[PDB]
Paper text:
TRPV5 is a calcium selective channel that displays constitutive activity in the presence of basal levels of the membrane phospholipid phosphatidylinositol 4,5-bisphosphate (PI(4,5)P2). The TRPV5 channel is tetrameric and consists of classic TRPV family features, including six transmembrane helices (S1–S6), N-terminal ankyrin repeats (ARD), and the TRP domain4. Two endogenous mechanisms of regulation, binding of PI(4,5)P2 or CaM to TRPV5, result in activation or inactivation of the channel, respectively. Here we have presented three structures of TRPV5, one in the presence of endogenous lipids that are likely to be involved in maintaining the structure of TRPV5, one bound to its endogenous activator, PI(4,5)P2, and one bound to its endogenous inhibitor, CaM.
In order to investigate the mechanism of TRPV5 inactivation by CaM, we incubated detergent solubilized full-length rabbit TRPV5 with calcium-activated rat CaM in a 1:20 molar ratio in the presence of 10 mM CaCl2. The stoichiometry of TRPV5 to CaM has been speculated to be between one and four molecules of CaM per tetramer and the affinity between CaM and the TRPV5 C-terminus estimated at ~0.3 µM24, therefore the high molar ratio was used to ensure TRPV5 saturation with CaM. This sample yielded a cryo-EM map at 4.4 Å without applied symmetry. This interaction is mediated by numerous hydrophobic contacts: Val644, Leu645, Val648, and Phe651 on the TRPV5 side and Phe20, Leu33, Val36, and Leu64 on the CaM side. A loop of the CaM C-lobe (Gly114-Thr118) crosses over the bottom of the TRPV5 pore, placing Lys116 directly into the pore. The ε-amino group of Lys116 sits in between the four Trp583 residues of the lower gate, forming a cation–π interaction and thereby blocking the flow of ions through the pore.
Numbering used by the authors:
A (entry chain D): 29 to 225, 230 to 639
B (entry chain E): 6 to 40, 65 to 77, 83 to 147
C (entry chain A): 599 to 652, 699 to 709
D (entry chain A): 201 to 225, 230 to 332
E (entry chain C): 29 to 225, 230 to 638
Write the structure that this text describes.
């Protein structure tokens, strides 16, 4: 791996040190180079142990006059690629490009090396091991380093722009995949001018990504708006203001399954999340939410609210029975009993609660049928990843639907313990409202602050909790075992003492005391020590740490909540039937424009 | 002008070694190896905005012509934004060019413009 | 303030009066205090005068003006 | 006294030192007001520390320089006033005005009262 | 001390006031000085009465013309250091070096004053009393004052660069011990160039510290990386990027006893935690922790948890017995009793309890056998104060081991009351885990935050708490000492009353009242006064001050934790055997470099 690169680099450097021809090459010992070239019997096709040209060495160290002497001696070395494992096709051409010695490049082309050679080595790979990726081509290297005259000369000597690398890299794609340089826009414009012809931008990669979609999923918004500058069309200016229109055809991704905007929101990068702030897309999503998204969301929320109440009142009226046996025992209260099935359904009220249960289960099965095929389409680990999507919200409603499906069988088998899945399913299903909080304006970022915080520092508190409370519970059980349990309470055995420490730790229960009877002499010091470490010390520190992280986090959730609503919007409009969703845009086919949808927009500004 | 002569006041005190109120050649001579006040005020006179002058005067509390860090923190607490005390020192490190722990009018106006 | 209060109210027998008796040193009936300091030698403050002898808070402070 | 009672100016302090030069003669500085206040004590309770250190300028006496470090001595005669009933220091610390607490930070007085505390005041306070 | 120093300084000023020869010398009244030099009876062997000479006076007051007029009649005073007590080796050469007067220095060398004359006075010492430390020999004074031409002249006229001081210091050492200047780097490179050649960098001090290690412990990081630049070896550049390498030979010092890294991480100075942010040591500790340290720490903590749970279940099933006697007493419930040791060891259940107890004691003894010889190596007061090293975590575990040793002795003597030390050692062993809570990233800085906070202002809350409850508890015991304790409770005597107030301050127990019976008139007022003064008043102030403190130290605690993890790293690599720890580096003897380990590293430039 990374370690192997060190060994091969140092061994390669050792073999550089070994060959005295290569020593005089790397050191430009031109007197001694004329001496070695005076030797006829010297092999001049010497290659390094990893497999290199002496011209590659001279190009590395820019000893260009020695390279002229070598090409004068043997030009055939100039046409040889590297035979390395990391460098399987490397030439001096890529090196002379990336080190920018134009006269040396002209000398290389004076020997006539092929521009279209493919350097596709292992280090030529978009990798976290590799530092900066560019792709294969010398055209790509001249473009990414930004030298005009080199790639101009390449165009003058062939070097077709329409090309492709592994993973479908084209020149525009790797120009997008760059750190921000002002020169990249200029070189993009230059190659766009030099394209002369379907268009060249129409081709996707191997993955199926047009470069516009690549710029969308990356979000280089300067490059985005400079690309969008061609899509702009002004209409008229007057006074201080200007009306214009945009072509939303490219931004639509209409007929494709791969929609553009969901592809934007389904990304790991935060900066592409920024690209929503651009001028066409913000207006479009605002219009589309305002005309349709909010009432469509509110009506479905109201329907789910109404759905929960029927399950609630179904859970109220369970069939019960008086307990048949006799418990004959203190600390034994089992006065009711589960009712049998054939005993149950006998009244009109039985029919009422039966059809009320039927409503719940038939809601549950279509919740399953709606939920399932979403999973196979998207990355499932991705599906639980983004809180913008609400993956962990989806987990609990899946489990709720699973449990309410499961609980029927125990009735069908008349299985005891019917309350046991039911209470869990109840309390989990009531938590299925928190997704709807993002629809309201004042309510949105609040619950995402909560969802951030429960993963944020709650575990830091929780892992600290168990050790100290377990040690004190052990101390309390091995201080209350000496004593009659009827008079003390809370400390009969080890599990109830363990749970009792959790009880009075967070001050749910008042501290244990007795007046009539005296106390153990050791208990006072132990409980006082626990009280001073416990309540005012670390709980209050959790309060302070909460308050300190609140201010530090509190900015980003606003942009995050504004990012949530458009994903909600596109997921809402995608799964509905089509007649409820008309065509956004302006049909200029009526207007002699022809089959394209536009957007008028104007802006008063200062001049 | 008053902050300007406040600069020459401490400067003349830096030239005046014994503090007698004069500058002799021996005081001048010790300067060269390291390389009256109205006489000094007149000599430096030939060598040499409103709102900024108004801004400095409310800022410098004692009117010594030099804002300290505690004066800045007192203004920064009067601003109403929370900051710790280390970056306030970095603000002094941002502005104090000659390194006296202080800012004059001239270090202030190069910061504002 | 606490110091000068207790030093006004406590009797003088516990306390020699601080200072330097220059009358021992022939200065005469006036008490002194010796003190020294090491200073830095910033060249830039000297260069121009002898030559003549020959980022959150900063933005808001600009906005406040 | 009225040169003290002013928005503090070194500009005004040049006039102060000027009129002190035009003092051509008992010592004129030793005058109290109707309240009994010397202008030294008036500047002390007023705490115009620029005027205070300019008042301190002629109180200095240097002793020697030594490369980057220099020794001197101060005259603490008028700063004590132990013979008087009204001490200078209590007159400073008892004031309605706030910024007089700043004049505690003067280079004669600070290390002096700190030394007088740490030799004396802390053990007596603890045992009391 | 300081007072003695200023007193003898003022006496020196008295003696310089005394003689008119020296007084006219410091005044430079050369007309009268011609009269004094014309006087034969004016003795010129007259020195300063407290241990100085007239040339020292002329050097102080820089009156070089008077010095020239002095040097004809008595040139031998130019070669004389005088006999003051803090100033015992001092010559006028030192003052002339200090005041940078090259003509004066040249005139002193014209008389031929010896440069090798060394000056080690009592004031000439590293001291908190001393404000400035400049070294001993005049070369050190020339270096710290930074005069190039003077130290050039000293080289021309002697002044060996190999200079050995009290405390074994050299010019390199006092260049390190210096307020930093870029000019000091130039002076350093200058004298390194004027060195001829073992090498001069190889010498340690009297303490045994090389200037490389001194620069490491003092953290003048500009000088540090600049000194590293000579050992830096670049290999090749291409395009935007540059592959280089470092010789990590002196930075490891694995063959030495005291390594560089344990030297740096064990220092009372703070800024040394910054020096680990230099690139090669950062990459080294990152590689070294990431390859090995985290799994070893995880498995060690796992085995410790497995020890603790077996100790816990040993502590569960203590052998017990019914209480034999009768109580004959209400307010007396004591139904249990200890067993005898002959009574205990009776069952197979007792057999497995006993083998678990054997596991506990054999895990107890190995803690002592591990860490006790480590304590003698370093200062124990140095050992406990270092929170980065986990000194306070070492405080708990030795008490834990001592008490678990003691309780078995208490058992074997059939002694009662073992439940109390068992209760102590139990909760101490459970709170012991927070040392091992360091290793996680999410868990790390939080515990040293709370460890800072418990020392921080907890006492400030505690002392005030004690005095205010000492007031109110006594007030409550006085106001309830007249009536039926069968109805009131909690205030029978003073010790239960104060503990009642301690319980009820924290709001854990609800306020006491019976609404059937009547209640005295004052207690309403007193209890309401306590409630307003205590419950909401300064408890909330504790919250606010707590929040402000956490807000301020929120920057620094991560900077602390980064040092804490590599301190843990170098500790565990010290104590573990070496077959688990192969050599980190690149054996250049494979590559013909020979017996050195390197590190290759690269990036593109910005
Ligand atoms: Ca002078
Ligand atoms: Ca000021
Ligand atoms: Ca300044």
């Amino acid at each position: 791996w990374e370690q192997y690169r060190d060994r091969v680099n140092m061994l390669q450097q050792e073999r550089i040190r070994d060959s005295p021809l290569l020593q005089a090459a790397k050191e430009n010992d031109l007197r001694l180079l004329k001496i070695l070239l005076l030797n006829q019997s010297c092999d001049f096709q010497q290659r390094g142990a990893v497999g290199e040209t002496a011209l590659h060495v001279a190009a590395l160290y820019d000893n260009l006059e020695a390279a002229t002497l070598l090409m004068e001696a043997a030009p055939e070395l100039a046409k040889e690629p590297a035979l390395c494992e990391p460098f399987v096709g490397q030439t001096a051409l890529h090196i002379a490009v990336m080190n920018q010695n134009l006269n040396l490049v002209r000398a290389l082309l004076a020997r006539g090396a092929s521009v279209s050679a493919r350097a596709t080595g292992a280090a030529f790979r978009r990798s976290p091991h590799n530092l900066i990726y560019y792709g294969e081509h010398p055209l790509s290297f001249a473009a990414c380093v930004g030298s005009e005259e080199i790639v101009r000369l390449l165009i003058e000597h062939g070097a077709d722009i329409r090309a492709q690398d592994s993973l479908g890299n084209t020149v525009l794609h790797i120009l997008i995949l760059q750190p921000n340089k002002t020169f990249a826009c200029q070189m993009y414009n230059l190659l766009l001018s030099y394209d002369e012809h379907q268009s060249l931008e129409l081709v996707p990669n191997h993955q199926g990504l047009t470069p516009f979609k690549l710029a969308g999923v990356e979000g280089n918004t300067v490059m985005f708006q400079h690309l969008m500058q061609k899509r702009k069309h002004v209409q008229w200016t007057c006074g201080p203001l200007t009306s214009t229109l945009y072509d939303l055809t490219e931004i639509d991704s209409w007929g494709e399954e791969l929609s553009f905007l969901e592809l934007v929101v389904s990304s790991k990068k935060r900066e592409a999340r920024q690209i929503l702030e651009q001028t066409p897309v913000k207006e479009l999503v605002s219009f589309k939410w305002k005309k349709y998204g909010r009432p469509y969301f509110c009506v479905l929320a109201s329907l789910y609210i109404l759905y929960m109440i029927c399950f609630t009142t179904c859970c109220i009226y369970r069939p019960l029975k008086l307990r048949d046996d006799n418990r004959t025992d203190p600390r034994d209260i089992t006065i009711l009993q589960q009712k049998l099935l054939q005993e149950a359904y006998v009244t009109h009220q039985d029919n009422i609660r039966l059809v009320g249960e039927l409503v719940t289960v038939t809601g549950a099965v279509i919740i399953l049928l709606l939920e399932i095929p979403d999973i196979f389409r998207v990355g499932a680990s991705r599906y639980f990843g983004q809180t913008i999507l609400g993956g962990p919200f989806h987990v609990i409603i899946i489990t709720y639907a699973s449990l309410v499906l499961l609980t029927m069988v125990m009735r069908l088998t008349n299985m005891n313990g019917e309350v046991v899945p039911l209470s869990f399913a109840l309390v989990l299903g009531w938590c299925s409202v928190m997704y709807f909080a993002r629809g309201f304006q004042m309510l949105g970022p609040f619950t995402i602050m909560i969802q951030k915080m429960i993963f944020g520092d709650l575990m830091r508190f929780c892992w600290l909790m168990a050790v100290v409370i377990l040690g004190f519970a052990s101390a309390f059980h091995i201080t209350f075992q000496t004593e009659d349990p009827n008079n003390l309470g809370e400390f009969s055995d080890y599990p109830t003492a363990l749970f009792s420490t959790f009880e009075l730790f967070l001050t749910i229960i008042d501290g244990p005391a007795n007046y009539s009877v005296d106390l153990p002499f050791m208990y006072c010091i132990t409980y006082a020590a626990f009280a001073i470490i416990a309540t005012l010390l670390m709980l209050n520190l959790f309060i302070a740490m909460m308050g300190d992280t609140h201010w530090r986090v509190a900015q980003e959730r606003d942009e995050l909540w504004r990012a949530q609503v458009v994903a909600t919007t596109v997921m809402l409009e995608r799964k509905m039937p089509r007649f409820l969703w008309p065509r956004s845009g302006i049909c200029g086919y009526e207007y002699g424009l022809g089959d394209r949808w536009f957007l008028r927009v104007e802006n008063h500004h200062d001049q | 002008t008053e902050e300007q002569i406040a600069e020459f006041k401490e400067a003349f005190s830096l030239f005046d070694k014994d503090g007698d109120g004069t500058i002799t050649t021996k005081e001048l001579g010790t300067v060269m190896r390291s390389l009256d006040f109205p006489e000094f005020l007149t000599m430096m006179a030939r060598k040499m905005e409103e709102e900024i002058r108004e801004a400095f005067r409310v800022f410098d509390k004692d009117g010594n012509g030099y804002i300290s860090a505690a004066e800045l923190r007192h203004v920064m607490t009067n601003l109403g934004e929370k900051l710790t005390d280390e970056e306030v020192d970095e603000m002094i490190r941002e502005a104090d060019i000659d390194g006296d722990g202080q800012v004059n009018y001239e270090e202030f106006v190069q910061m504002m413009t | 303030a606490t110091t000068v209060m207790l030093e006004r109210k406590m009797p003088r027998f516990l306390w020699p009066r601080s200072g330097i008796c220059g009358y021992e040193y022939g200065l005469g009936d006036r008490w002194f205090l010796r003190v020294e300091n090491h200073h830095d030698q910033n060249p830039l403050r000297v260069l121009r005068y002898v030559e003549a002898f020959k980022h959150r808070g900063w933005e808001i402070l600009r906005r406040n003006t």
